[PDB]
């Protein structure tokens, strides 16, 4: 129940404002900046502000804060969803999200803001559907918005019917300083770029554990996805009935399903780091990386970030494989490895100086995060079984998909 | 299939060596298609096994079945899920339609001795589907 959706800037200036109900005065935006400054300076800053009887709930963008003022007991989740949809629409329409496009795309920005939400209730949020009625370079609105299928425009025709899938894995490990992993969860991400002719009804089928148990084949390798979040095109009723994933893919790249299940296996990359930091004399970084993944998979672009001292200077790196560079901007040692074959072991011996004068305040111990990305390796073991592409006209589709294994929240707690 | 013919003798020898009663990860061949075994493919595989021998009358074992499924997946890209048998006790029919192989008693269904037996009626009659309509959807 937002009252006025406005876009701020880094200096407190409102780049663009669009009131939807008019119950909140436009002058309340000026007090948002002082309120945010006071909250940040006292540790009480939150995404949802409160200027008397008006609440300023907004998120932080790349360069401006999309604060949406409200007065009644409006749904905070609804406001956040509307802000996320607006950000996604802006990203789809404008390649950059900064002040350079706010002051240059006002003619289309105002129209998009007016069409997106009326009276504080959003009605259209699909960038592909919205691009057929609001352009910066007007016909009647498309029937897709009025029709039930609001995520697949009818009449799309292509020379070929090729759909590219992307089974991107997210290996997140929360390893404590004692050496044990506390939060070790892998979140799947099935992103597909559907490019076909017409409005095909995709019938996604994988080796799900529940599906295998229902069919009676609960004995082979099945992915045990604890949480499965289907897209808007995916029919919730069909999935709830008999695990049938039937939905119409959209035109372009979109996220169909987002699996999320816990992982009880050993980490793909094991980092054994030591800190022989002398008392204002020197420091030693005996960091050893052990690859627990399969030898057939190579972790391309392996970047194990080792947090070095903030005031360290004149550092020396004695490693074995991969270039080690210290970035003063980040205040950490970037153990960058181009190719990391499975089962490899890289040993590094850091050595940096330290000023004689002790620091005035503590700096903390940021966790060590690895950036391993091993392609063609599915940690969860989930493999796509079938993709039922059915069209009324009748055509031979050529579906494709690739499995990518990367590191998500794979941080290692320091000592 | 020259590759299938070559792998049939080695697969049969490995199955015979394994008695009737280390590396982590799931590598995937780049560009190798992966899909469930088809009824026609299952029928062709059953016919080839019957002609070459080594599968009809062999003692059914978990290790031998797993080795055969792995070899079939390596040589054809078929998922190792179509080589399922109906629950016992008694004669177990193939779960996938078109399979000509079935398990029959040779003497709790788990302790019963079972052996692979060729059955051409399996490729035409859905014995597994009829026995377990719920499992077939």
């Amino acid at each position: 129940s937002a009252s006025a959706v406005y876009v701020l800037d880094l200096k407190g200036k409102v780049l663009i404002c669009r009131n939807y109900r008019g119950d909140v005065d436009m002058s309340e935006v000026e007090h948002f900046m002082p309120i945010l400054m006071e909250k940040e300076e006292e540790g009480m800053l939150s995404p949802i502000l409160a200027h008397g009887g008006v609440r300023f709930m907004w998120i932080k963008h790349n360069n401006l804060y999309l604060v949406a003022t409200s007065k009644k007991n409006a749904c905070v989740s609804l406001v956040f969803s509307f802000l996320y949809k607006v950000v996604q629409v802006f990203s789809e329409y404008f390649k950059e999200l900064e002040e350079e496009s706010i002051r240059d795309n006002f003619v289309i920005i105002y129209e998009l803001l007016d069409e997106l939400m009326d009276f504080g209730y959003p009605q259209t949020t699909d960038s592909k559907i919205l691009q057929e009625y609001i352009t910066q370079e007007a016909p009647r609105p498309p029937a897709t918005v009025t029709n039930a299928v609001s995520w697949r425009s009818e009449g799309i025709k292509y020379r070929k019917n090729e759909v590219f899938l992307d089974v991107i894995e997210a290996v997140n490990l929360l390893v404590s300083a004692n050496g044990n992993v506390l939060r070790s969860e892998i979140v799947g991400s099935i992103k597909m770029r559907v490019f076909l002719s017409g409005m095909p009804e995709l019938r996604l089928g994988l080796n799900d554990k529940v599906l295998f148990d229902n069919t009676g084949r609960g004995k082979s390798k099945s992915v045990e996805l604890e949480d499965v979040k289907f897209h808007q095109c995916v029919r919730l009723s069909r999935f709830e009935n008999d695990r049938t994933i039937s939905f119409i893919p959209p035109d372009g790249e979109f996220e169909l399903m987002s699996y999320r299940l816990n992982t009880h296996v050993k980490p793909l990359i094991w980092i054994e780091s030591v800190i022989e930091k002398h008392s204002h004399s020197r420091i030693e970084y005996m960091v050893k990386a052990k690859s627990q993944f399969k030898r057939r998979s190579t972790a391309n672009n392996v970047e194990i970030h080792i947090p070095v001292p903030n005031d360290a200077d004149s550092p020396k790196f004695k490693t074995t494989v991969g270039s080690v560079k210290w970035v003063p901007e980040n205040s950490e040692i970037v153990w960058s490895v181009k190719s990391f074959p499975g089962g490899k072991e890289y040993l590094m011996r850091a050595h940096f100086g330290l000023p004689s004068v002790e620091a005035e305040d503590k700096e903390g111990k940021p966790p060590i995060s690895v950036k391993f990305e091993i392609p063609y390796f599915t940690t969860s073991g989930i493999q796509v079984r079938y993709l039922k592409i059915i069209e009324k006209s009748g055509y031979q589709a050529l579906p494709w998909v690739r499995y990518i294994t990367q590191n998500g929240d794979y941080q290692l707690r320091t000592q | 299939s020259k590759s299938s013919v070559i792998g049939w003798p080695a697969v049969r020898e490995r199955m015979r060596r394994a008695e009737p009663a280390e590396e982590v990860g799931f590598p995937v061949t780049p560009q190798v298609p992966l899909r469930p075994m088809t009824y026609k493919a299952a029928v062709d595989l059953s016919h080839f096994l019957k002609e070459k021998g080594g599968l009809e009358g062999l003692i059914h074992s978990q290790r031998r079945q797993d080795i055969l499924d792995l070899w079939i997946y390596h040589t054809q890209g078929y998922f190792p899920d179509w080589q399922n048998y109906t629950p016992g006790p008694g004669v177990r029919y193939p779960l996938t339609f078109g399979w000509c192989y079935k398990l029959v008693p040779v003497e709790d269904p788990e302790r019963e001795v079972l052996e692979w037996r060729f059955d051409s009626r399996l490729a035409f009659h859905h014995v597994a589907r009829e026995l377990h309509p719920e499992y077939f959807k």
């Binding site: 899938l165 069919t215 392609p375 079984r385 039922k388 494709w400 | 899920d81 077939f136």
Partner: peptide, 18 residues
């Protein structure tokens, strides 16, 4: 070629489940 694993063709349905 493509970084992150080469794209592989997908099947149409569970042919082994009828």
């Amino acid at each position: 070629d493509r970084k992150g694993g080469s794209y592989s063709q997908a099947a149409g349905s569970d042919s082994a489940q009828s």
